[PDB]
Amino acid sequence: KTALEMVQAAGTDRHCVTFVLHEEDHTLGNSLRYMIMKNPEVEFCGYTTTHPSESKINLRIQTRGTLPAVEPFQRGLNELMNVCQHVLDKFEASIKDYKDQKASRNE
Amino acid sequence: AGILFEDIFDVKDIDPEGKKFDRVSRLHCESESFKMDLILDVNIQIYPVDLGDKFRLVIASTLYEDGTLDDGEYNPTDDRPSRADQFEYVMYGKVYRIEGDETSTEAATRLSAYVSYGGLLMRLQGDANNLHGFEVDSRVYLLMKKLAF
Amino acid sequence: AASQAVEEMRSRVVLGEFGVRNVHTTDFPGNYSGYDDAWDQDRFEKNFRVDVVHMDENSLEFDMVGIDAAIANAFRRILLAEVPTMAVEKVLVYNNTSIVQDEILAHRLGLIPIHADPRLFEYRNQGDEEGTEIDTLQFRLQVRCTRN
Amino acid sequence: DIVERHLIDGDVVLFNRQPSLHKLSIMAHLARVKPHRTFRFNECVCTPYNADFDGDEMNLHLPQTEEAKAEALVLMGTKANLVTPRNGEPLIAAIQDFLTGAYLLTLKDTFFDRAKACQIIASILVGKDEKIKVRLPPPTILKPVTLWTGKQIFSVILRPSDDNPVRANLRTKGKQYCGKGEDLCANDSYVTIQNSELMSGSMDKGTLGSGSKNNIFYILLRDWGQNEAADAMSRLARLAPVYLSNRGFSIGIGDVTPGQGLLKAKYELLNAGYKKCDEYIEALNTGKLQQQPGCTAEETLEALILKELSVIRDHAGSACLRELDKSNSPLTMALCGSKGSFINISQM
Amino acid sequence: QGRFRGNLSGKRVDFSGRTVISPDPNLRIDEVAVPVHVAKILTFPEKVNK
Amino acid sequence: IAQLRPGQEIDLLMHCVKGIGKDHAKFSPVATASYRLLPDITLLEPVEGEAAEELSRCFSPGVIEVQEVQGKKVARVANPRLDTFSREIFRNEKLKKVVRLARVRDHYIFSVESTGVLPPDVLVSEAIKVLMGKCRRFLDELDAVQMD
Amino acid sequence: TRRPEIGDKFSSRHGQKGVCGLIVPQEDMPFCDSGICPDIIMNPHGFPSRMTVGKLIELLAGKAGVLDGRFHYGTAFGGSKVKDVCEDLVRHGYNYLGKDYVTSGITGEPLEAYIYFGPVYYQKLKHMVLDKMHARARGPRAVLTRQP
RNA sequence: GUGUC
């Protein structure tokens, strides 16, 4: 199967890279563009849908200077993985403590 | 020090024809060193200018004293201490429509200059020799700062 | 005086009689020339918090502090579709003697949700209609009307 | 060996309507297979066909011989046929929604940031643009906030990159020209594009509208080649609508509501009009109303009170404009000129 | 409904169709979307080169 | 489901399979998935008695409490949470400069309401894992891509 | 049995006919506060030229009725006014005329301007695209003249 | 003959 493709610009060899993601929507596009805009080494980053009856998303990444656009992608993706991991870890403990406290105060 | 123009202005009128926008307003200024009419638009939400205030206006290029002229502007990088940290309002626009005074049909020496900061208009009038540079096509940075005394 | 309205512009969102100002979320590096924000992960961990307001039989109300709209909207979007569950797909009707349509009956039966744990069941391969034991649940329905 | 295969993408296929009056009612486009079981095409080319998009069923033809496949591409070409032989005005510029979006984008009131600018120009690299580097123009106002100006977003459609040699130059006025100044206007209704970048003015029905001269795409096609006019017509249809959808444009019943200070303004007019018109009756009965035109008694009375009724409506409509807000959706559409006019506002 | 401008002028064509139109602002100026059901019926003859 | 009469019979056998809500609406595991920004009501000047009692009625009940203490009839914000935004303060322009409505853009109130298939407190915890399921599957192939 | 698709003609019972455009899933179609999604998106650009004011009044009356719980009369040269109905829409807690605070879904950001929400009686018409669709390459010909 | 553009 085809997960992701890479389209590099004719002029810029490793400065303007467009990743083509298959079978995805604006969910992973907006979170990823946020995570990459959090990075200070990125100039232009943006996702767009090819067609509403399709599932191909073009996501462009540009870095200020001479730096490949593949590293910030995985960097932001791992940072988002850690963010959701921590969000789940805190939510589980909050739910647990609230539930045990409610059960205690009820009976 | 590539200073194209610098002076101290005072606001006489502000937004005379009612109010149309919610973030931009017209400004009418005047000077004391050289007789000149300066009109520009500034953001009220960011820079809340009021009536009867004195500010300092500087039009120049090449913020950094080190470099001759640089290629691209970087937002957080501060390699060279520029003039923007000392002031409090920065714009980057270009000049166009170099025309003069048309009221005086015979000999006059009053020249005007129009600048467009990507939508916001600026009109300057004044002496011929006071305007030393101000070429037809020039990328110029505007610098404004409040002077409260 | 103006710096205060500046930090308040990005913190809270003002509501007017017509139109809403300060809508876009600006907390990225290079935007503001007074502060710096690149990741601050360890600082973000101590600023984020979750609370539970109300928890009912089939409704949960919770609160998230210190988070943007992007990941929250992603959560809300994937809560609907990407979370799988079980539902009726295929229907064999033996003898339909009534007024309702067979297609409408199948649609209304598929609209019926099922109290089952979808974690134990697998995902069906590309295609098979015979039905294995691990990825298909059988249900029977039979009723005929008689006089009293 | 002759082989007949199915319709593939990249075919010169004719698409037209049945009520043909002019010669631009039939055109040839490139075919595209899409599984939705319906005909789909761009809205900009809807004016040549004069479709209404509610009950229209258009037809489609397929050339069979290779000799005719090349003749329908050079003569009946969408890029070639953009002006009409009747007068010479460009017929394919824009429709109501795109005009309204382009007007709301450039208002000398919109202010973006570094992040939203990268998203508005993110929906513009979709086609032959993936192998093209896009540039970020220098920001105007950055001492405090480094925020972006919405008028510089619109200048990207003209010059998307550094390699594209597009240098447009237009200087004209709008439909709301206040006067008393050529480019120091009060409502900024004066467009001045220099070196393919917007300097002043807001885009209205007279600048990029269909059925008008001094048009953006028209001047772009006259100065440069015609291929650059069609590549920049679809870039606007992908930039304006998404921004308009994310901004929010709506109309309710609160928009059209009479002001309390307006009800007594027209009450005076109606009372004075009635008091003045109901006098000419007994004036004619007594024998009066000296006549300038050669006519009969009832004819002069028919037009003497006909000008008394239009004054009430005109004065009411003119006093209503000072009573409305600056965000009224019907008034906004009237100022833009997409679908509506001041007559409809004064009538509603 | 004659033979001069009814048949000779008319001469109803083949390899054609007609369908209701719908908007799609995701194509170019010279593009049009054709359903696959119609594309399967229509055929275009061409000779095989090398 | 259906209505029968004397002389009618219905017999069906349905198959239940696993699916995601993006395929069909019947595979939606949650009935309502929504959130709300935290409200904020900030007063500017001290109000008088009747103005306070009239402002208490302009809002939803239980927002602005009128404290009457021995000389004063002041208004006080106690709980702005239970307040549906109707912005009815701009109806009468008599006060018009007493309230400021805002939304704190780091506070989110999520209210999940499940149909009854699974507890709603587990749906949010599963959505977090589903969000990273793809962030991991993309890195899985990026590993092989950068391996070359 | 048929389902609505792209190319079907619908009406608004107010002289406003149109074919369907894009079929949008539920992740889009923003909710305002409670989680109510737009069932059919209407364009505000066809209102001024057509000059139809009864549509907004009917929407307002229908919303007030479904909130209160009684049918509102809308007969010609009478019925109900817009003075007693809007003051009744305040008792519940909504805005008085038409406006609500919406939160865009594709981005996750609020909308600057307010959107007009409400229930409307729509009707489905004939002339589906399923029957208004024809294509022919080589078929039968007439015996008098060899023509389609 | 009816219905739509």
Is G9 annotated to bind a ligand? Reply is yes
Phi-psi region of D10 (alpha: psi -120 to 50; beta: other; left: phi over 0): left
Check: CB of residue F77 under 8 Å from CB of residue F98: no
For helices A70-106 and A26-37, angle between their N-to-C axes, nearest 10 degrees: 110
Mark out the alpha helices in chain D (DSSP H runs). Answer: 46-49, 66-69, 71-74, 96-105, 114-120, 150-154, 216-223, 227-231, 233-247, 260-286, 297-304, 306-321, 329-336, 342-347
- Across the C:D interface, residue pairs with CB atoms under 8 Å apart total 33
Resolution in A: 2.9
Question: Residue with structure tokens 């817009």?
Answer: G82
CA B65, CA B82: separation in Å to the nearest integer? 7
Angle at D173 between CA D171 and CA D179, to 5 degrees: 125
Residues from B contacting C (CB-CB < 8 Å) are: 22, 45-48, 75-76
Phi-psi region of G104 (alpha: psi -120 to 50; beta: other; left: phi over 0): beta
For residue E17, list chain G residues with Cβ-Cβ distance below 8 A. 133-136
CA B50, CA F32: separation in Å to the nearest integer? 50
Nearest of D325, D174, D251 to residue G50 by alpha carbon? D251
Question: Residue with structure tokens 């039968």?
Answer: G140
Instruction: Sort A43 into a burial class: Cβ within 10 Å, 0-12 / 13-18 / 19+.
Output: buried
Is G17 annotated to bind a ligand? Reply is yes
Nearest of D136, F133, B89 to residue C82 by alpha carbon? F133
* Closest nucleotide C1' to the C-alpha of G17: H4
Neighbouring CB atoms inside 10 A of D238's CB total 17
Q: Which residues contact G81 (CB under 8 A, 6 or more apart)?
A: none
Check: CB of residue E22 under 8 Å from CB of residue E34: no
Q: Do G48 and D333 touch (CB under 8 A)?
A: yes
- F144 residue type, one letter: A
User: Binding-site residues of E, please?
Assistant: 5, 12, 18
Instruction: Sort C104 into a burial class: Cβ within 10 Å, 0-12 / 13-18 / 19+.
Output: exposed
Q: Do G94 and F86 touch (CB under 8 A)?
A: yes
Which among D109, D145, D184 has CB closest to B23? D109
Q: Do E41 and G135 touch (CB under 8 A)?
A: yes
Is G55 annotated to bind a ligand? Reply is no
* Closest nucleotide C1' to the C-alpha of D54: H5
Per the structure, the count of domains in chain B is: 1
Check: CB of residue C32 under 8 Å from CB of residue F93: no
Residues from D contacting A (CB-CB < 8 Å) are: 34-36, 115, 118-119, 121-126, 130-134, 136, 163
Q: Which residues contact D249 (CB under 8 A, 6 or more apart)?
A: D100, D104, D329, G44, G113
- The dihedrals phi and psi of F86, each to the nearest 5 degrees, come to -115, -10
Domain containing D128: what range?
96-247
CA A37, CA C23: separation in Å to the nearest integer? 18
User: Binding-site residues of E for DNA, please?
Assistant: 5, 12, 18
Q: Do C29 and A80 touch (CB under 8 A)?
A: no
Domain containing B118: what range?
5-149
Chains touching A (3+ CB pairs < 8 Å): C, D, F, G
* Closest nucleotide C1' to the C-alpha of D56: H5
- Residue D17 CA distance to nucleotide H3 C1' (Å): 19
Q: CA distances (Å), F122 to each of A96, F117, F129, in order?
A: 12, 11, 11
Question: Residue with structure tokens 């134990």?
Answer: C120
Q: D336 CA to chain G: closest CA distance, Å?
A: 12
Work out whether strand A42-49 and strand B24-30 pair parallel, antiparallel, or are unpaired: unpaired
Q: CA distances (Å), D175 to each of A6, B119, D234, in order?
A: 47, 19, 25
CA D82, CA D91: separation in Å to the nearest integer? 6
- Residue G50 CA distance to nucleotide H2 C1' (Å): 28
Phi-psi region of B118 (alpha: psi -120 to 50; beta: other; left: phi over 0): left
Query: Which pair of structure tokens corresponds to residue E33?
Result: 């979307």
Neighbouring CB atoms inside 10 A of G34's CB total 11
CA C97, CA F7: separation in Å to the nearest integer? 8
CA F89, CA B104: separation in Å to the nearest integer? 56
Query: Which pair of structure tokens corresponds to residue A100?
Result: 């045990």
Work out whether strand D26-33 and strand E31-34 pair parallel, antiparallel, or are unpaired: parallel
Query: Which pair of structure tokens corresponds to residue D225?
Result: 């080649």
For residue A27, list chain G residues with Cβ-Cβ distance below 8 A. 27
List A49's β-bridge partners, or say none.
Answer: A57
- Closest-approach residue (CA) in chain D for B96: D194
Q: Do G109 and C18 touch (CB under 8 A)?
A: no
Q: Which residues contact E30 (CB under 8 A, 6 or more apart)?
A: D29, D30, D77, D78, D79, D230
List C18's β-bridge partners, or say none.
Answer: none
Q: Do A27 and G27 touch (CB under 8 A)?
A: yes
Q: Which residues contact C107 (CB under 8 A, 6 or more apart)?
A: none
Q: Which C residues, 14 through 43, put their C-beta within 8 Å of a C-beta on chain G?
A: 15, 18-21, 23-25
* Chain A interface includes C65 (CB < 8 A): no
Query: Which pair of structure tokens corresponds to residue D19?
Result: 């009520």
CA G21, CA E24: separation in Å to the nearest integer? 8
Check: CB of residue A85 under 8 Å from CB of residue F132: yes
Q: What share of chain F is helix, strand, coil (3-state, %, to 5)?
A: 30, 35, 35
Domain CATH code at residue D221: 1.10.274.100
DSSP state string for F48-67:
-HHHHHHHHHHS-SSSEEEE
Q: CA distances (Å), G22 to each of A52, D38, D144, G124, in order?
A: 8, 11, 42, 17
Which of G31, G83, G89 best tests the F interface by mutation, with the highest count of F CBs <10 A? Answer: G31
Helix (H, G, I), strand (E, B) or coil at C21: coil
Question: Residue with structure tokens 């037009």?
Answer: D303
Q: G5 CA to chain F: closest CA distance, Å?
A: 15
Question: Residue with structure tokens 């009053």?
Answer: B110
Nearest of D100, D286, C15 to residue F37 by alpha carbon? C15
User: What b/e sequence results for G60-90 when a residue is b if at least 16 CB atoms lie within 10 Å of its CB, and e otherwise?
Assistant: bbbbbbeeeeeebeeeeeeebeeeebbeebe
For residue F32, list chain G residues with Cβ-Cβ distance below 8 A. 35
Q: Which residues contact D97 (CB under 8 A, 6 or more apart)?
A: D43, D240, D241, D244, D338, G43, G45
Mark out the alpha helices in D50-89 (DSSP H runs). Answer: 66-69, 71-74
DSSP state string for C66-102:
S--HHHHHHHHHHTTTTS-EEEEEEEEES--BSSS-H
Nucleotides of H under 7 A from a protein CB: 3-5
Q: Which residues contact A30 (CB under 8 A, 6 or more apart)?
A: A47, C70, C73, C74, G107, G108
Question: Residue with structure tokens 């401008």?
Answer: E5
Question: Residue with structure tokens 């595209």?
Answer: D32
Check: CB of residue G56 under 8 Å from CB of residue G112: no
Helix (H) or strand (E) holding A83: helix A70-106
The yes-or-no reply on F/D contact (3 CB pairs or more, < 8 Å) is: no
Work out whether strand G99-100 and strand C85-93 pair parallel, antiparallel, or are unpaired: unpaired
Nearest of B29, B105, B122, B35 to residue D183 by alpha carbon? B122
Neighbouring CB atoms inside 10 A of E28's CB total 21
Helix (H) or strand (E) holding C46: helix C41-47
Question: Residue with structure tokens 């307003």?
Answer: B25
Neighbouring CB atoms inside 10 A of F26's CB total 19
* Chain F interface includes A6 (CB < 8 A): yes
Angle at G81 between CA G75 and CA G84, to 5 degrees: 135
User: What b/e sequence results for D159-177 when a residue is b if at least 16 CB atoms lie within 10 Å of its CB, and e otherwise?
Assistant: bbeeeeebebebbbbbebb
* Chain E interface includes D310 (CB < 8 A): no
E8 DSSP assignment: I
Q: C5 CA to chain D: closest CA distance, Å?
A: 12
Phi-psi region of D179 (alpha: psi -120 to 50; beta: other; left: phi over 0): left
D139 DSSP assignment: P
Chains touching C (3+ CB pairs < 8 Å): A, B, D, F, G
DSSP state string for chain G:
-----TT-EEE-SSS-EEE------SSSS---SS-PPPSS---TTSHHHHT--HHHHHHHHHHHHHHHTSPPP--TT-S--SSTTTTHHHHHTS-SSSEE--B-SSS--B-SS-EE------EE-S--TTTSEEEESS----SSSS--
* Chain C interface includes D118 (CB < 8 A): no
User: What b/e sequence results for B109-120 when a residue is b if at least 16 CB atoms lie within 10 Å of its CB, and e otherwise?
Assistant: eebbbbbbbbbb
Nearest of B25, B24, B21, B1 to residue B13 by alpha carbon? B25
CA A88, CA A71: separation in Å to the nearest integer? 26
Helix (H, G, I), strand (E, B) or coil at D283: helix
- Residue B7 CA distance to nucleotide H5 C1' (Å): 68
* Chain F interface includes A83 (CB < 8 A): no
Work out whether strand E16-23 and strand D39-41 pair parallel, antiparallel, or are unpaired: parallel
Q: Which G residues, 31 through 90, put their C-beta within 8 Å of a C-beta on chain F?
A: 31, 33-35, 90
For helices D96-105 and D233-247, angle between their N-to-C axes, nearest 10 degrees: 70
* Chain D interface includes C6 (CB < 8 A): yes
Check: CB of residue D159 under 8 Å from CB of residue D166: yes
Please tell me the number of Cα atoms within 13 Å of D69 on its side-chain side: 14
Which of E11, E16, E26, E30 best tests the D interface by mutation, with the highest count of D CBs <10 A? Answer: E30
